[PDB]
Amino acid sequence: GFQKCEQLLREYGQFCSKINQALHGANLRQDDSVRNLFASVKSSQSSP
């Protein structure tokens, strides 16, 4: 939250955009991994 720091941070480019996008993609990857995995465990027919 310090403005002086934020001012200096800006000189490193869109650093935080890169951090957020990299993690966003990495997190989507698990939702996709899970969705695919369960779609395959799922039975068509099953007994109670």
Binding site: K42, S43, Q45, S46, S47
Partner: protein, 49 residues
């Protein structure tokens, strides 16, 4: 949760067969990446211009 078709077991020497009466064909599409773009860098120029 999408429940599977429930097929009961029988108290007998017989069994229940849940068997299709109809069918269709469908296509599962799949992409497999085999490569990445190949890149080289003129590191000396990149860093010092």
């Amino acid at each position: 949760f999408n429940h599977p078709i429930q097929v009961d077991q029988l108290n007998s020497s017989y069994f229940k067969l849940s068997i299709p009466t109809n069918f269709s064909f469908g296509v599962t599409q799949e992409y497999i990446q085999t490569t990445i773009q190949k890149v080289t860098v003129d590191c000396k120029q990149y860093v010092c211009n």
